[PDB]
Design a protein around this nucleic acid. Structure first.
Length: 200
RNA sequence: GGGGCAAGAAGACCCUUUUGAGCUUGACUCCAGCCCGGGCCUGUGGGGCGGGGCGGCCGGCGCAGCGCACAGGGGAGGCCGC
């Protein structure tokens, strides 16, 4: 536990300062969890849920997405989709968040499903009456094949208490998805590109 | 000495009994013996080797782009000059 001392390290990361922050307070510090009993031979790979946000949408939804500064795509790349897939991975990688429209719904389910699914960037279709600008701005756990798991929780520019709440969401997650819970996790370390790690 | 299916003897053969016994073996279940390990008996000093935990450090070769991309990172600044 020790939230004050753990937050003292979160405070130290903000105090060293320096860095190249992108839409976050002191960039993002990701806790690297190590798993004491996890075997690739054993199969528990369940994958479950500012950096870069983006939306593709029509009436009402577009008004509150393009205004938010995310930027929008007019599916003019539908023309590019026939021509090339060279930047398909690149475009999806650039925007951590993709959003969509309920009016569009099946417009590209029949044609532009292609490489965008391999990239995993399936947008969230939002009713024009639905606000949309919240779910996109708000912005991770897969066992996969890697013992080391580091999920960004410093991406919020919100106070270190919210970052600790993101740490608590991360730690609640470690209790929920693991058989020994927090005991199953061998180690955790707070890091950024210029952020030295902090063993939890 | 032909016969009294003459006299000996609750057929020994054969079969039956939920009747035995001796023997056998890779029958069922076991037991002494013996081998082996650890503990106690059981004092007083050395020396090495692992494990566990920390903990630095050195590595990683199917090729376009920059060369063997171990992996999950992060990111327009750290300190590269990149």
């Amino acid at each position: 536990i020790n939230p004050e001392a753990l937050n003292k390290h979160i405070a130290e990361i903000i105090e060293r300062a320096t860095n190249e922050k992108p839409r976050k307070f002191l960039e993002t510090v990701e806790l690297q969890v190590g798993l004491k009993g996890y075997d690739p031979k054993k199969d528990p790979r369940f994958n479950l849920p500012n950096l870069k946000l983006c939306v593709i949408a029509d009436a009402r939804d577009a008004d509150r997405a393009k205004k938010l500064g995310l930027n929008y795509v007019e599916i003019e790349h539908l023309q590019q989709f026939n021509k090339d897939a060279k930047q398909i991975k690149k475009f999806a990688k650039s925007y951590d968040v993709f959003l969509a429209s309920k009016s569009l719904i099946r417009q590209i389910t029949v044609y532009a499903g292609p490489g965008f699914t391999k990239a995993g960037r399936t947008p969230l279709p939002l009713a024009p009456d639905e606000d949309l600008e919240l779910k996109v701005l708000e912005c991770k756990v897969q066992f996969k094949k890697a013992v080391g798991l580091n999920w960004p929780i410093g991406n919020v520019k919100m106070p270190a208490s919210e970052i600790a709440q993101n740490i608590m969401t991360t730690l609640n997650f470690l209790a929920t998805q693991l058989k020994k819970g927090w005991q199953n996790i061998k180690t955790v370390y707070i890091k950024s590109t210029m952020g030295p790690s902090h063993r939890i």
